[PDB]
DNA sequence: CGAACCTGGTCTTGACTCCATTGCCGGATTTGTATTAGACTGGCAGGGTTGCCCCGAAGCGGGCG
């Protein structure tokens, strides 16, 4: 997700079957942690996915 | 055959002129330092976006003692 003058972010499936948020070129950081950082429950994730 | 002549360099005397060269000397300018008393109390900030290669370092899984 490329913005103009913002901050990059990526959701890359690794060598294993794990999706990972890389915000502003940080480390692997799986995406359910990012949804919980949006306050999304694990139940809300389960309902969504 | 001998005597003067005028004039080249070669040099000397002494007076005249003119300008460097300090030395003050007084003033102008300029370089550095100090001092401001109400209260103020943690920064903005884009280059990064390659490809490939070698290698050093962390980190964890794996067997292990």
* Residue A23 CA, nucleotide B34 C1', distance (Å): 54
Q: Are A21 and A11 in contact (CB under 8 A)?
A: yes
Closest nucleotide to the alpha carbon of A6, via C1': B46
* Residue A16 CA, nucleotide B43 C1', distance (Å): 42
Q: How many CB atoms lie within 10 A of CB A22?
A: 15
Resolution of the model in angstroms: 3.6
Q: Are A35 and A29 in contact (CB under 8 A)?
A: no
Paired residues of A42 in beta bridges:
none
- The answer to whether strand B lies under 7 Å from the CB of residue A8 is yes
- The answer to whether strand B lies under 7 Å from the CB of residue A26 is no
Q: Which residue has the tokens 């389960």?
A: A46
CA distance A4 to A9: 12
Distances (CA, A) of A48 to A5, A24, A41, A45: 31, 26, 10, 5
């Amino acid at each position: 997700v490329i913005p103009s003058r913002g901050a990059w972010l990526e959701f890359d499936v690794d060598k294993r079957d794990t999706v990972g948020v890389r915000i502003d070129r940080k480390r692997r950081q799986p995406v359910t942690v990012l949804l919980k950082a949006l306050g999304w429950t694990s139940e809300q994730i389960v309902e969504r996915f």
